[PDB]
């Protein structure tokens, strides 16, 4: 697909940041190496459900004033194409497949089959969690349902699973045409307190490490590489300075389009014609 | 000022950037916000859920 690393990072960082900040022992583990007073002051101010201060995330160049006490500024950077395929063919498909998804589901009995229901039509099934079927189990997929023989499996009549699958758009042939790009985004934790900037740096590094395992950047946005700048005053001529430490996140990812092929051939036919010269 | 309002900010109140002495105008996508539907305490803004 076409991709937007900045909007991915914003969407991914915001919930993760919230869920760490609402959970005191995570911060208590992340900041174990800092000075005791720095740790306790940060945990008192920003952390837990009762926290009176708050962190914020957003893109650069807003028209309004931000929470300069603690704010992650996201800042889309450079990139370049790095590797190309022969014919620019990144892949080919017989059935137009959408995004990868993971969904929780439960088995139910139906007509002496077990079935799992999924919210969308299954374009491909990658994994039913914790199950490997035998041929006897007569595994079949149909529409948005996975179906599974009941006879030997009655103990599992309400078994709970996670389905990893991917959507289908439509039944069509085509070529995925495109290339790989290596692209940079900068993130900086702004604070007018230097110890807050240093803690926001630690929290962001933890978040990015945790992010490396996510399906989003396992399937796309691969090879996350991190670089770190000096701590410096970002703005120097207010009533106080604003400090930050930049980090650069670099990703390798595919830019591509679905070139559908309308041509289809369903019968050869043969004829002999005679040359009398 | 402008703020996006979310469940946390409803429950906890928006901490305002400025030390507001008084409000001269307050509005949302649905129109003006009437004084029974907002309150300021301790430089926090509380809104009707």
């Amino acid at each position: 697909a076409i991709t937007s690393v900045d909007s991915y990072l914003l969407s991914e960082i915001k919930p993760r940041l919230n869920t760490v900040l609402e959970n005191c022992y995570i911060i208590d583990e992340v900041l174990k190496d800092f000075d005791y007073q720095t740790r306790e002051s940060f945990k008192e101010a920003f952390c837990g459900k009762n926290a009176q201060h708050e962190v914020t995330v957003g893109f650069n160049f807003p028209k309004f004033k931000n929470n300069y006490e603690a704010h992650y500024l996201i800042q889309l950077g450079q990139g370049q194409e790095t590797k190309n395929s022969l014919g620019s063919i990144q892949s080919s498909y017989f059935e137009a497949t959408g995004d990868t998804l993971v969904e929780s589901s439960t088995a139910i009995r139906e007509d002496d089959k077990l079935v799992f229901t999924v919210s969308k039509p299954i374009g491909e099934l990658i994994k039913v969690e914790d199950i490997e079927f035998a041929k006897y189990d007569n595994l079949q997929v149909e529409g948005n349902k996975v179906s599974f023989k009941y006879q030997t499996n009655e103990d599992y009549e309400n078994y709970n699973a996670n389905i990893i699958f991917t959507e289908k758009k439509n039944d069509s042939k085509g070529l995925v045409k495109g290339f790989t790009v290596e692209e940079q985004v900068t993130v900086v934790g702004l604070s007018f307190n230097v110890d807050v900037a240093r803690c926001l740096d630690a929290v962001l590094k933890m978040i990015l490490i945790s992010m490396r395992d996510s399906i989003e950047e396992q399937q796309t946005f691969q090879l996350q590489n991190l670089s770190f700048g000096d701590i410096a005053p970002i703005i120097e001529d207010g009533d106080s300075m604003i400090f930050g430490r930049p980090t650069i996140i670099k990703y390798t990812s595919s830019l591509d389009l679905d070139y559908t092929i309308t041509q289809d051939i369903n019968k050869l036919t043969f004829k002999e014609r005679k040359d009398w010269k | 000022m402008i703020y996006f309002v979310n469940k946390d900010r409803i429950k906890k109140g928006i901490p305002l950037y400025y030390d507001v002495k008084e409000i001269t105008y307050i509005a949302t996508q649905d129109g003006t916000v009437y004084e029974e539907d907002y309150e300021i305490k301790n430089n926090r803004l509380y809104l009707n859920e």
Binding site: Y68, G238, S240 | D19
Partner: peptide, 12 residues
């Protein structure tokens, strides 16, 4: 210089 960056309550 004006107090924009860090903003504190009025004394009363």
């Amino acid at each position: 210089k004006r107090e924009d960056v860090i903003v504190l309550q009025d004394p009363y």
